[PDB]
C-alpha cells in the first residue's frame, strides 16, 4: 500500500512507515507535516489521480532538518589561467511517514 506525493521539485514513492528525505520544509523538528499533493496510490485498492487524487493527505513526523555532505565544486580551464572552487552542502529534511491517506 504505497503512494506518490509531489514534494520537492519532484515526486516520491512512500510505503508508509518509511524514512524519507526531501528538500527543506521550514517546519519544526518533531512536528508532523502533511503532504497535500498526492498523485497515486498502490495496493489492493488503487486510486489514481488527475493531477492530485482529490483529498487524501499523506502524513509524516519530521525527523531531522540537517544538511547533506559537502561536495566541493571545483572546475578549471586548461592552459588559459583560471579555476574556481566552491563548497556546497544542500539542506534537507528527514521525515518518517505514518498513515498514507489519513
Amino acid at each position: 500500500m504505497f503512494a506518490i506525493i509531489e514534494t520537492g521539485g519532484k515526486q516520491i514513492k512512500v510505503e508508509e512507515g518509511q524514512e524519507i528525505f526531501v528538500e527543506k520544509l521550514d517546519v519544526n523538528e518533531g512536528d508532523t507535516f502533511t503532504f497535500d499533493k498526492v498523485l497515486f496510490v498502490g495496493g489492493d485498492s488503487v486510486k489514481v489521480g488527475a493531477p492530485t487524487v482529490e483529498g487524501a493527505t499523506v502524513t509524516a513526523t519530521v525527523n531531522k532538518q540537517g544538511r547533506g555532505k559537502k561536495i566541493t565544486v571545483f572546475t578549471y580551464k586548461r592552459r588559459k589561467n583560471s579555476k574556481r572552487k566552491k563548497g556546497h552542502r544542500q539542506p534537507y529534511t528527514k521525515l518518517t511517514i505514518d498513515k498514507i491517506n489519513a
Binding site: 504505497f2 514513492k13 488503487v46 488527475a50 571545483f74 578549471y76 579555476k83
Partner: protein
C-alpha cells in the same frame, strides 16, 4: 624579519595528496601529479553530476518503454496518452510502479489508452 617557509606548504600538499587516496601508482603520492589528477577529478565530477541527471532519466524511459511494449503499446503513445489523460506522474515513478505493482501500472495503461 625573515619569514621561513615551514609548515604551511607541506600541509597544503598533504591535504592535496590526501584527496588522492584512491589513485593508482604515483598519482597517490607525488604532489604535482596528484594535484593535476585531483583537478581533473573535480571537473569530471561536476560534468558528471550534470550528466547523471540525464543517464538516470534515459534509464527510466527505457524501462517504461519496455513495460508498455509488454502491453502491446508504444512508449510514445503511452506517454502522449497519459498527457492527454491529464496524469502527471514522473518517469522514475512509472518505472518503479512497473516494478513494484504490475496491476496498478496496467491500470494506468488502460487509463492512458482512453482519450485516444
Amino acid at each position: 624579519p625573515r619569514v621561513k617557509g615551514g609548515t604551511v606548504t607541506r600541509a597544503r600538499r598533504k591535504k592535496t595528496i590526501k584527496l588522492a587516496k584512491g589513485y593508482f601508482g604515483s598519482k597517490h603520492t607525488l604532489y604535482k601529479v596528484a594535484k593535476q589528477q585531483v583537478m581533473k577529478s573535480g571537473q569530471y565530477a561536476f560534468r558528471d553530476r550534470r550528466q547523471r541527471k540525464r543517464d538516470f532519466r534515459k534509464l527510466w524511459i527505457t524501462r517504461i518503454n519496455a513495460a508498455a511494449r509488454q502491453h502491446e503499446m508504444s512508449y510514445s503513445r503511452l506517454m502522449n496518452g497519459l498527457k492527454k489523460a491529464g496524469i502527471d506522474i514522473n518517469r522514475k515513478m512509472l518505472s518503479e510502479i512497473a516494478i513494484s505493482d504490475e496491476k496498478a501500472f496496467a491500470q494506468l495503461v488502460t487509463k492512458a489508452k482512453d482519450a485516444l
